[PDB]
Design a protein around this ligand. Structure first.
Ligand SMILES: NC(=O)C1=CN([C@@H]2O[C@H](COP(=O)(O)OP(=O)(O)OC[C@H]3O[C@@H](n4cnc5c(N)ncnc54)[C@H](OP(=O)(O)O)[C@@H]3O)[C@@H](O)[C@H]2O)C=CC1
Ligand SMILES: COc1cc(Cc2cnc(N)nc2N)cc(OC)c1OC
Length: 159
């Protein structure tokens, strides 16, 4: 089982300038709840994006995908291919617009957070993968974050 998890603006933007372009404090706990105790896979840039005090993410086996055989990632496992990263029975791909695209075909689950923020795509932004009709989903109820942004959770699956 390979699952993807991300938070996106309605527009599909998930990253800009190397950061997540919004504040949603409730996201951290939902992300934790889903990923805790599992192996997590991320692209090198997502690893770099993680604050130094929080990486590697605690309670999870951190796997970082990189083309540099010499890449240094303390507390994480650096691999050079997707096949080497997906060996666990339950793996969660936590990032990179690139890595989500790469891992989507191996996936049978997607946990998505839609952020109701006006943020049109700009050239160079990290974008979420598009889910075609092979996916079946359930949309949760919109809620208000204390940051003032409205958001909702989606759960998709396919066999
Ligand atoms: N909103 C959300 O939920 C999330 C948003 N993000 C955002 O996403 C952005 C980063 O996304 P993005 O720029 O696409 O980067 P990625 O995180 O996907 O990392 C891309 C890197 O992964 C490695 N890589 C990619 N493909 C391969 C491959 N086929 N084989 C081996 N290594 C590979 C390379 O590392 P190298 O160059 O070292 O070889 C490449 O530069 C940031 O802005 C981040 O904040 C991240 C996570 C969640
Ligand atoms: C928990 O800390 C982070 C987690 C993530 C990945 C991530 C965060 N939220 C969601 N919903 N899906 C994800 N894959 C990405 C981050 O920065 C890009 C983080 O630092 C803020």
């Amino acid at each position: 089982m390979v699952g993807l998890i991300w938070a996106q603006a309605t527009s599909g933007v998930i990253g800009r300038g190397g950061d997540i372009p919004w504040r949603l404090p409730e996201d951290q706990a939902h992300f934790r709840e889903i990923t805790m105790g599992h192996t997590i896979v991320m692209g090198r840039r997502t690893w770099d994006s993680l604050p130094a005090k929080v990486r590697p993410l605690p309670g999870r086996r951190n796997v970082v995908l990189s083309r540099q055989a010499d890449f240094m990632a303390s507390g994480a496992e650096v691999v050079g291919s997707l096949e080497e990263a997906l060996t666990s029975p339950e793996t969660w791909v936590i990032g990179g617009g690139q890595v989500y695209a790469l891992a989507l075909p191996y996936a049978t689950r997607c946990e998505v957070t839609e952020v109701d923020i006006g943020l049109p795509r700009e050239a160079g932004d990290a974008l979420a993968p598009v889910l075609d009709e092979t996916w079946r989903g359930e949309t949760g109820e919109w809620r208000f974050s204390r940051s003032g942004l409205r958001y909702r959770l989606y759960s998709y699956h396919r066999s």
